[PDB]
Design a protein around this ligand. Structure first.
Ligand SMILES: O=c1[nH]cc([C@@H]2O[C@H](CO)[C@@H](O)[C@H]2O)c(=O)[nH]1
Length: 272
């Protein structure tokens, strides 16, 4: 009732554009362009609202009008955007996307320096508020310094961390002992551990590596091989019967009181 989840991460305007016919690289080739709310953190925040939790986004948008519409749009979806930064005169984050007639991803551009405005100084302004959430979800779009501040100031509140990409995930390597649940895919787990994840035969040693480095819980998506989960206390298994629904799933199930393995399976069904 007074239980709420806090999400710290980025909010993007996803722009998806594709031509209707073969792309003439000359003049305005008619097509269909879709604007979309995005960012890993903002997406997880929205999914938690849909799941029935009181979700607070801690993010940054620019004063660029389309920033304020991102906030409003996610607000309508349930999220308490009341606390975000509106950054004066910055481009709000966005994730440009160029699809094909087959929805085939051609090129993708990413403008997210505003993500760096989610500072420790900003987060410290809500130290009390953040320290009273039932759980904190952070993505690795924010700076090393900011994520360091979250992990250092969670006041025993569990931090679920979404690694976002192989490039952005590394900022957590030295801080796995502060992360309650980490959700890497194959490449991100390879990148973090330095151990090749060639197939199911290798997850045992990867997970063992994560735990040696203090990770409480690993939820490792192996794509087609399904999901491997591993608790430092010993419980591991496979669920082998999107990632933004997965993270929301895991965090919501935790707050709901659900055991680890049952949460992985549930979140994996929120994913599909
Ligand atoms: O580096 C990043 N790329 C893409 C995203 C966002 O993730 C979403 C897809 O899961 C999408 O909305 C994009 O903006 C991000 O947060 N960081």
């Amino acid at each position: 009732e007074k239980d709420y989840v806090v999400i710290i991460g980025s909010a993007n305007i996803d722009v998806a554009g594709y031509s209707h016919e073969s792309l003439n690289y000359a003049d305005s080739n008619p097509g269909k362009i879709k604007f979309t709310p995005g960012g890993v953190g903002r997406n997880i925040a929205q999914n938690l609202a849909l799941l029935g939790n009181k979700a607070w986004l801690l993010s940054a948008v620019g004063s660029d009008f389309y920033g304020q519409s991102l906030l409003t749009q996610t607000n309508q979806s349930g999220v308490y955007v009341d606390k975000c930064l509106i950054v004066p005169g910055e481009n709000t984050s966005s994730y440009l996307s160029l699809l094909d007639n087959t929805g085939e991803m051609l090129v993708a551009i990413n403008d997210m320096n505003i993500s760096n405005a989610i500072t420790a100084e900003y987060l410290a302004q809500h130290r009390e508020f953040i320290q009273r959430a039932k759980v904190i979800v952070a993505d690795c779009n924010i700076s090393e310094e900011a994520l360091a501040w979250i992990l250092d100031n969670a006041a025993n509140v569990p931090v679920f961390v979404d690694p976002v990409s192989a490039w952005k995930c590394v900022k957590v390597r030295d801080r796995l002992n502060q992360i309650h649940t980490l959700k890497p895919n194959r490449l991100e787990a390879e990148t973090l551990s330095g151990i090749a994840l060639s197939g199911r035969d290798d997850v045992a040693k990867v997970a063992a590596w994560f735990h040696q480095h203090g990770l409480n819980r690993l939820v490792l998506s192996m794509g087609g091989d399904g999901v491997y989960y591993s608790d430092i206390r010993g419980e591991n298994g496979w669920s082998a019967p999107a990632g933004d629904a997965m993270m929301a799933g895991l965090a919501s199930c935790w707050v709901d009181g659900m055991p680890f393995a049952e949460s992985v399976r549930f979140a994996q069904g929120c994913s599909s």
